[PDB]
Nucleic acid binder design. Structure first.
Ligand SMILES: [Cl-]
Ligand SMILES: [Cl-]
Ligand SMILES: [Cl-]
Ligand SMILES: [K+]
Ligand SMILES: [Mg+2]
Ligand SMILES: [Mg+2]
Ligand SMILES: [Mg+2]
Ligand SMILES: [Mg+2]
Ligand SMILES: [Mg+2]
Ligand SMILES: [Mg+2]
Ligand SMILES: [Mg+2]
Ligand SMILES: [Mg+2]
Ligand SMILES: [Mg+2]
Ligand SMILES: [Mg+2]
Ligand SMILES: [Mg+2]
Ligand SMILES: [Mg+2]
Ligand SMILES: [Mg+2]
Ligand SMILES: [Mg+2]
Ligand SMILES: [Mg+2]
Ligand SMILES: [Mg+2]
Ligand SMILES: [Mg+2]
Ligand SMILES: [Mg+2]
Ligand SMILES: [Mg+2]
Ligand SMILES: [Mg+2]
Ligand SMILES: [Mg+2]
Ligand SMILES: [Mg+2]
Ligand SMILES: [Mg+2]
Ligand SMILES: [Mg+2]
Ligand SMILES: [Mg+2]
Ligand SMILES: [Mg+2]
Ligand SMILES: [Mg+2]
Ligand SMILES: [Mg+2]
Ligand SMILES: [Mg+2]
Ligand SMILES: [Mg+2]
Ligand SMILES: [Mg+2]
Ligand SMILES: [Mg+2]
Ligand SMILES: [Mg+2]
Ligand SMILES: [Mg+2]
Ligand SMILES: [Mg+2]
Ligand SMILES: [Mg+2]
Ligand SMILES: [Mg+2]
Ligand SMILES: [Mg+2]
Ligand SMILES: [Mg+2]
Ligand SMILES: [Mg+2]
Ligand SMILES: [Mg+2]
Ligand SMILES: [Mg+2]
Ligand SMILES: [Mg+2]
Ligand SMILES: [Mg+2]
Ligand SMILES: [Mg+2]
Ligand SMILES: [Mg+2]
Ligand SMILES: [Mg+2]
Ligand code: NA
Ligand code: NA
Ligand code: NA
Ligand code: NA
Ligand code: NA
Ligand code: NA
Ligand code: NA
Ligand code: NA
Ligand code: NA
Ligand code: NA
Ligand code: NA
Ligand code: NA
Ligand code: NA
Ligand code: NA
Ligand code: NA
Ligand code: NA
Ligand code: NA
Ligand code: NA
Ligand code: NA
Ligand code: NA
Ligand code: NA
Ligand code: NA
Lengths: 73, 237, 56
RNA sequence: ACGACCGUAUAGUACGAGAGGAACUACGGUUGGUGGCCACUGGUGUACCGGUUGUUCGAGAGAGCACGUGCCGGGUAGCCA
RNA sequence: CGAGUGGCUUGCUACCUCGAUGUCGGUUCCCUCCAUCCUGCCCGUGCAGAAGCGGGCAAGGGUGAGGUUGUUCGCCUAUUA
RNA sequence: GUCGGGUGAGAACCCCGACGGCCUAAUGGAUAAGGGUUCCUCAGCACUGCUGAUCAGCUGAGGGUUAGCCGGUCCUAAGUCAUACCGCAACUCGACUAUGACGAAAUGGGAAACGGGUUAAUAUUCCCGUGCCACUAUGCAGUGAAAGUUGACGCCCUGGGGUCGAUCACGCUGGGCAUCGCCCAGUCGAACCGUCCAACUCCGUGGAAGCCGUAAUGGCAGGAAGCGGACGAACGGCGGCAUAGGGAAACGUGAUUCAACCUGGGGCCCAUGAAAAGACGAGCAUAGUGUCCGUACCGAGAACCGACACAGGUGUCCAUGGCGGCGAAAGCCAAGGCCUGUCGGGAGCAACCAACGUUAGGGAAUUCGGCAAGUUAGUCCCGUACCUUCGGAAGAAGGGAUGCCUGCUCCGGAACGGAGCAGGUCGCAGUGACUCGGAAGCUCGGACUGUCUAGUAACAACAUAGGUGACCGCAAAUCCGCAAGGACUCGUACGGUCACUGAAUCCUGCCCAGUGCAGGUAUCUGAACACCUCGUACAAGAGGACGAAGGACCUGUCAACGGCGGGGGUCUUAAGGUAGCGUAGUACCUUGCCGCAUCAGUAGCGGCUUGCAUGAAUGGAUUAACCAGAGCUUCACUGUCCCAACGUUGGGCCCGGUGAACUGUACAUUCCAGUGCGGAGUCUGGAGACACCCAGGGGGAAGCGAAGACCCUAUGGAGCUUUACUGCAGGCUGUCGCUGAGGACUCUCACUCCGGGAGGAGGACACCGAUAGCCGGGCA
RNA sequence: GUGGAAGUCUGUUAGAGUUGGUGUCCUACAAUACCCUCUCGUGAUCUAUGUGUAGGGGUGAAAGGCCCAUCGAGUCCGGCA
């Protein structure tokens, strides 16, 4: 997490940076396979190390609240 | 006095220009004769240096290879279609007429065939609301009701890269690197921190603006600074 | 660093050179223009009235 | 080119109800200033002798360098306080 | 209340210098004045003594160390003839 | 540097030998720019050289630079130019769009060379040997031939392959040393051609339900291990090259760690890390061709820039030479270079000065202030407070250990790697030199890293993330241009513009009267054209009607500018200071009062606090971490001080040589007093005074240096400001023209934009040209 | 235990910067130098070369800083006696 920031920046900065990266790094259940293998390749880019699926998603999460709403309607 | 920073900008000198030569593609909708037979396969997902968000590499049946404004939920192998009779799913582009209401849409055109203008940045999306033979009301991300020609093409889905603004830059270095990829002079010196000669707010023995910050719309360049034609200011009230 | 002697040492750049047209060492090799005769900027030879006293 | 102080004897005396408490003189020392001198104490002493670290001359012996002595210990004369 | 002396303070003046007489405080080093703080010699005393107090002659010598403060000034401590 | 010697009319510094030193990322080696012949040889000393010179970068004369395979040349980069178009009064001016060209010599991409020899001076260029590339021609093969690959790419961590170098063992050749048996050098050999292949990828087989694998992540019934196979690397191994070359000779062999070079795995991005030419794809023989330009030397404490042979400035590669040690550190020493950071001789060499060593007792008493100096130090073991945003604080603090010798143990494949053990043992001292933190506490400020006044300010100032407000739907907001046009923008509100505040945490009160901005508006005010009236055979002109933006008037708004008192138990002018903080970097009074601390404390800290004249994004309070920031305290330390001494090196003094400058109305041996435009070596009165010279520290010449920065004056200047005067851009608005058909409306045909186009949107508006009113320190 | 993040720490690695000494110099070695001390040193880093922005205009993490020893409006010549 944000622990690499040393004793700098303050609570909120290391708080949000940690949490965001916590959820960002989580074992994500892949789209092209229900296997927990999705890794952030860059800003908004994701990939299932399993089936090699490279896809678009939120900047930090593979799926965004607004993204899930798309499939619905 | 000397010309203020906003005036230097206009000159379009190196410091103020965007690193165009490093930019990848001018993401624009395709030009199909008609029919709608045009389709293609997502070959890759790239980072767009101009928008800090993903752009999808696509290869069309007619050999054409072009990058595109990728909405969320698009990956390699997927088949995207463009045309009047295109399917109604994410990544596909068709006029607002052929688009069912209540469905989030991005990269909307202003004038049919202009390649798309509205809602193209990270996470945003418009909202097709009302249909007609003449008009197609679309709610832009700013919350404005934009009356549009039903012929205006658009893409289904929310622009990819959503939530970018959630995490703070934390340190100047991170801002530095971002700013370095845009047409913007950074860092920013406060007017009130300059000399009278340099900015209308400059001067004094302490830092504060001379006159009130709200400036008339009619103000000339060199003077139009601070709160431009503010209808109000502050939070209270 | 001083703008004087210490700033003089970096001066190993060639700019003004012998002019193919006027023979003067004023052909700026980076601008490709002669500061003396205007060669590279003008078909006409560089000349101004202020090069001499107004009534002469 | 000498200025000033403290102390002892005078004296628990003169004076004084008492408490308290002088002086002339004679001595001893202190401080400040002054001039000189180095037996004594002290400093210096890259004169000198010893110990020792690194490195170089193969080892040994014996040496060079380490800022104008590598460092450490001792220190004659002289100059000094 | 009245008469003065000084030229340290302050004020006044605008004589001297604006082709520049380097600031305040401090320091260091030298000479001087006396309206004398100490020391020498004296007079008075509401001078018993001791300790003082006031005054006279007198400028040989002395008049030191520190805490706050840039301070001069001043406040404070302990020594001191 | 010294002693000898050489040359020469002449030698401290020109040459030779010896002894002695200096330089180690440089004072060595290779180069870029820049210089431009400085390079080599001969002959010289009038010039230049911090003294001299027989020497020289100087003077004169000669000579010297050789390329198919090193560079240029070619390609394209940020970007530049030329032509066309368009603008402009106009151009040597100017933006866009086309086209073409230009744009990289160390250091982007890129067809191809190595070894030896040779000159006074060149050298992958010449010579000898061997090799390679491209093109063309002939001959044979081939019909393939363009899909694809390559050129071609960020930052961080990391494994494997592996050459040189270094080191180790051993052998051989040569050298050195002389109580020993050690120590040093060498032990060679290319490009190229052929061959080998780890890694990655894939295929077959196989068949794991828990195994496989890694430094680490990881892998798998969608098929794990194992086995076989396809593809496939080095500037690497191996063979040739080579009874080539080189060496006086031997002309080794193994190993370890491994720069170069090769090949993999992992991680990061609100950051995404060139292009084009070319090459590959796509064989072989023989032959021919391979022009043009650069090539000397310096590359720096004398060849460059800085007026100089200037202590300054100036890019790249050699980062693997030995000991040492964590090390590209110190210190010492090779190789290579040098004694040219170029004046010498003499005095125990005084005073005084610059650098510096050591000083007893005391120990900050010094001083604005510990300024300066000193103390501490490396490594391991033990141990470690308040506080804190939980990261940190922290090497907190404090305590102990540390060498050598002998013999060993553990880790590891091993190191000439690391961690330990037992015994013996020397010194005052074992990180023995070198290298190498002084520690603790309170307060102020800014959160942090960062920025800044090139040349007196590095800070609390700027920036920053973070917070906040404002404008804008893109034919936009903002901005540049006279125009043609342009930046933002290969951008689209999670945007980007314009501003304020300045991390996190707790918070951010009341005020819209004035000013600003914005919205509305019955009525009032409000220009010009057109229209009506009068006037004039026309016209000037006078009046009227209609009335835009703007204003009056009304509302909104303070994280807009700003404000938050007097009086009495309301009044000015809207409100009347809330949380907090407070004698403040804000408090005049003031050294406020009380306390802590000291012998003594205008200081510092704490409390109080009526605050001359604190206070909430003109941000208020608080706060860990950070700091060449301001103040204060303690321990430690010490020549800062008491109070100075001695010593060391370079000067200083004397001698040879070289050789300036500042300054100068005149006179001038002055001292005490006086006088004078009131601050005299020169006037007046006295006193003193023989002349010249050496050294000194600077009392005076109101010393030298600068036509005073301070102050005033001038109908002087400039930068800046504004509700100063007057104007000028610009924005908004009406009217006219472009402009057309049928106080409200339709249309299409000009005009504008979108779309490749068909065609769509818009449309007499907009744009553009003209004029009028308003705003208008943006500018003059 | 592994891992090896960081506008992270120590650091005269290279390199960059410039705090104090108010030292040395101050007709200098130098029209901004020397020495010691001190700061940064994986990043908003440093740097070479090429290239763009031009004078009421640039450029400016803002000091009225910088734009060739020239800056509250560069330099040259002209207006100009
Ligand atoms: Cl941003
Ligand atoms: Cl070359
Ligand atoms: Cl690996
Ligand atoms: K004066
Ligand atoms: Mg676009
Ligand atoms: Mg933000
Ligand atoms: Mg930029
Ligand atoms: Mg700012
Ligand atoms: Mg300022
Ligand atoms: Mg202004
Ligand atoms: Mg402020
Ligand atoms: Mg302010
Ligand atoms: Mg300058
Ligand atoms: Mg020695
Ligand atoms: Mg004087
Ligand atoms: Mg008297
Ligand atoms: Mg006297
Ligand atoms: Mg010649
Ligand atoms: Mg020569
Ligand atoms: Mg000769
Ligand atoms: Mg070219
Ligand atoms: Mg190249
Ligand atoms: Mg040569
Ligand atoms: Mg050469
Ligand atoms: Mg020299
Ligand atoms: Mg002592
Ligand atoms: Mg004191
Ligand atoms: Mg004192
Ligand atoms: Mg100090
Ligand atoms: Mg073992
Ligand atoms: Mg030591
Ligand atoms: Mg204070
Ligand atoms: Mg700071
Ligand atoms: Mg400065
Ligand atoms: Mg600083
Ligand atoms: Mg400074
Ligand atoms: Mg600030
Ligand atoms: Mg902000
Ligand atoms: Mg913001
Ligand atoms: Mg107080
Ligand atoms: Mg407020
Ligand atoms: Mg006389
Ligand atoms: Mg004057
Ligand atoms: Mg003035
Ligand atoms: Mg003026
Ligand atoms: Mg257009
Ligand atoms: Mg003005
Ligand atoms: Mg750091
Ligand atoms: Mg450091
Ligand atoms: Mg440059
Ligand atoms: Mg200023
Ligand atoms: Na101001
Ligand atoms: Na008087
Ligand atoms: Na007076
Ligand atoms: Na004068
Ligand atoms: Na004084
Ligand atoms: Na006296
Ligand atoms: Na005092
Ligand atoms: Na090979
Ligand atoms: Na080593
Ligand atoms: Na010489
Ligand atoms: Na830093
Ligand atoms: Na108001
Ligand atoms: Na108002
Ligand atoms: Na206030
Ligand atoms: Na800093
Ligand atoms: Na000393
Ligand atoms: Na004098
Ligand atoms: Na001015
Ligand atoms: Na862990
Ligand atoms: Na310095
Ligand atoms: Na100008
Ligand atoms: Na003139």
């Amino acid at each position: 997490r944000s622990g690499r920031f040393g004793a700098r920046y303050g609570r909120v900065s290391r708080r949000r940076v940690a949490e965001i990266e916590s959820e960002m790094n989580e074992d994500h259940a892949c789209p092209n396979c229900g296997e927990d293998r999705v890794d952030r390749q860059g800003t908004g880019i994701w990939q299932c190390s399993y089936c090699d699926y490279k896809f678009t998603g939120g900047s930090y999460k593979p799926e965004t609240p607004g993204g899930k709403t798309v499939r619905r309607s | 006095g000397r010309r203020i920073q906003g005036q230097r900008r206009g000159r379009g000198t190196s410091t103020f220009r965007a690193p165009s030569h490093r930019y990848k593609a001018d993401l624009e909708h395709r030009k199909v004769e008609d029919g709608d037979v045009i389709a293609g396969t997502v070959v890759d997902i790239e980072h767009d240096p101009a928008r800090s968000a993903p752009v999808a590499a696509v290869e069309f049946e007619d050999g054409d290879r072009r990058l595109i404004l990728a909405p969320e939920g698009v990956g390699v192998g997927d088949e995207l279609q463009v045309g009047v009779s295109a399917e109604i799913a994410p990544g596909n582009t068709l006029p607002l007429a052929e688009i069912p209401e209540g469905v989030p849409v991005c990269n909307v055109e202003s004038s049919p065939g202009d390649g798309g203008k509205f809602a193209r940045a990270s996470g945003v999306n418009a909202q097709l609301l009302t249909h007609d033979r003449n008009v197609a009301v679309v709610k832009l991300p700013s919350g404005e009701m934009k009356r549009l020609d039903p012929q205006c093409r658009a893409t289904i889905g929310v622009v990819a890269g959503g939530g970018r603004t959630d995490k703070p830059f934390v340190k100047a270095g991170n801002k530095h690197h971002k700013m370095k990829a845009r047409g913007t002079k950074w860092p920013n010196v406060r007017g009130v921190a300059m000399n009278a000669v340099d900015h209308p707010f400059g001067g004094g023995g302490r830092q504060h603006p001379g006159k009130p910050k709200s400036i008339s719309r009619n103000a000339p360049p060199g003077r139009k600074v601070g709160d431009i034609a503010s209808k109000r200011t502050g939070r209270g009230g | 660093t001083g703008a004087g002697t210490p700033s003089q040492g970096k001066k190993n750049t060639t700019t003004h050179t012998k002019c193919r047209r006027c023979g003067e060492k004023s052909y700026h090799t980076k601008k490709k223009v002669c500061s003396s005769c205007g060669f590279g900027k003008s078909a006409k030879r560089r000349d101004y009235e202020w090069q001499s006293k107004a009534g002469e």
